[PDB]
């Protein structure tokens, strides 16, 4: 299992 957690989509610059 891996709970990726970062909203849904990564908040990069």
Ligand X SMILES: *[C@@H]1O[C@H](CO)[C@@H](O)[C@H](O)[C@H]1O
The residue ranges that bind ligand X (CB under 6 A) are 7-9, 11
4 vs 11, beta carbon nearer ligand X: 11
CA–CA–CA angle 8, 5, 11 (5° rounding): 55
2 vs 6, beta carbon nearer ligand X: 6
7 vs 13, beta carbon nearer ligand X: 7
Residue 2: CB minimum distance to ligand X, A: 18
Distance from C-alpha of 2 to C-alpha of 13, rounded to nearest angstrom: 24
Greatest CA span in the chain, whole angstroms? 28
């Amino acid at each position: 299992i891996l709970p990726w957690k970062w909203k849904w989509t990564p908040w990069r610059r």
